[PDB]
Amino acid sequence: DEIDKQNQVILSELCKQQAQDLIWAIRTLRANFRDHQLESSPRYDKIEDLFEPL
Amino acid sequence: DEIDKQNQVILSELCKQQAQDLIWAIRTLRANFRDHQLESSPRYDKIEDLFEPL
Numbered sequence: 869d870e871i872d873k874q875n876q877v878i879l880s881e882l883c884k885q886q887a888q889d890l891i892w893a894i895r896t897l898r899a900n901f902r903d904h905q906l907e908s909s910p911r912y913d914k915i916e917d918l919f920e921p922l
Numbered sequence: 923d924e925i926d927k928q929n930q931v932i933l934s935e936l937c938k939q940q941a942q943d944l945i946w947a948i949r950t951l952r953a954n955f956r957d958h959q960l961e962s963s964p965r966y967d968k969i970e971d972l973f974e975p976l
Contacts, residue, residue: 899953 906916955976960966 899956902953904949904953
């Protein structure tokens with residue numbers, strides 16, 4: 869109901885996002901993506917190859 | 923005042939420490955101490971040698 873006004877309301881929930889310190893995030897990702905590995909189990913099949921380019 | 927009873931009271935503050943996951947902490951330290959380095963400034967003198975044996 870009142871579909872037009874939703875354009876504002878949805879936006880009012882999209883602007884409450886929390887900012888992320890880019891330097892901290894990238895340094896943490898670099899540190900914790902050098903040696904840490906996933907379990908080689910069928911539960912984790914085809915879930916590691918998504919991360920190698922990253 | 924009431925010097926003896928403080929043995930209990932002080933204990934009640936030393937027993938409130940937050941539990942720390944010794945796997946997460948050591949993995950974070952290992953990942954972050956591999957390459958991250960402090961500034962070589964007259965303010966951080968003799969502050970890097972303290973962290974080497976760790």
